[PDB]
Amino acid sequence: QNRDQMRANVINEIMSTERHYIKHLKDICEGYLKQCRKRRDMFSDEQLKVIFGNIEDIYRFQMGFVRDLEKQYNNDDPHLSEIGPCFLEHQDGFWIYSEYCNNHLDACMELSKLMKDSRYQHFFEACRLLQQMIDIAIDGFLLTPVQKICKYPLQLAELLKYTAQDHSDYRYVAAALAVMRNVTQQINERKRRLENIDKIAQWQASVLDWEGDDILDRSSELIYTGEMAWIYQPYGRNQQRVFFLFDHQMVLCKKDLIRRDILYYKGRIDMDKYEVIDIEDGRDDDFNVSMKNAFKLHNKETEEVHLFFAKKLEEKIRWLRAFREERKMVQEDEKIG
């Protein structure tokens, strides 16, 4: 015991937070959603869609989950409850949080936007006053499922700690811990980083004179970007461009001479066909120039060669690190698929 009891504490706490959480879901879908649907004159279809997301779906799933959990609860002996199986058979269901975790910041945006009108303020205040919730604004209550999907592996780790190796629930609790950890990280990497993938499309559209395929055809991450001087070929003329490095390719633009916030597409490089040669200080061979803070890009199959100058040394280092970064990313992406 006091270990064989601790587990009973963990089980009971989990059950608690689940009942409270499903109650918060109820107070959300009944207290806020319903009333906003009732008032077309204040909330569009688009507005509702942005603010609440798939929360009704979430509630619908949580109901069944908590239901099976209560089925698995042992009243004669709480710490005997076998609850791993529950998480395991509903392991797919949790992916509906992905969506919710994606459109959350947008919900915070529209909420902050609608918190400027006293109408919506008094309305929300009233709604929260009817459903008997705590004095937390709606933006707070809208964070609870992001919290809850993050809390799960924390609660599973604790349950495992006070689970005996011979417990019929041991392997299931373990497996489920692995599962929820996986889920949380998948949510995270997919939403955050692949919506980083989203915004580069915006940037691309901001660019003028676009030549070639869309960048998102081969790439999917902005590594580094900076202004550097460069020379396309030996005896070439020095040009001031702005470089954008992505996985597989590096696009370069020219800044308008007057409207500085304007970019004209000037070409791209296939990094899968180029190696980075770090050039030391001093004097170059034909080519044939003098150098400080400089490096070079060499074609693997061709004798093609390009010259690059940063301004500072910090930038030479940042850039070299950015190329190493790019190669590591290519290797890792092709390895993971």
From Swiss-Prot:
Residues 6-190 form the DH domain. It comes from the Eukaryota. Disulfide bonds: none annotated. Changing residue 193 to H: Defects in binding to phosphatidylinositol-3-phosphate and in formation of GPHN clusters. The keyword Cytoplasm applies. GO terms for molecular function: guanyl-nucleotide exchange factor activity. GO terms for cellular component: cell cortex; cytosol; GABA-ergic synapse; glycinergic synapse; plasma membrane; postsynaptic density; postsynaptic specialization. It is found in: Cytoplasm; Postsynaptic density. Keywords: Cytoplasm, Guanine-nucleotide releasing factor, SH3 domain, Synapse. Detected in brain, throughout the gray matter. Detected at low levels in heart and skeletal muscle. Changing residue 7 to A: Loss of formation of GPHN clusters. Its main location: cytoplasm. Residues 221-328 form the PH domain. Residues 3-13 are annotated as: Interaction with GPHN. One of its GO terms (biological process) is receptor clustering. Changing residue 4 to A: No effect on GPHN clusters. Acts as a guanine nucleotide exchange factor (GEF) for CDC42. Promotes formation of GPHN clusters. Interacts with GPHN. This is Rho guanine nucleotide exchange factor 9. It comes from Rattus norvegicus.
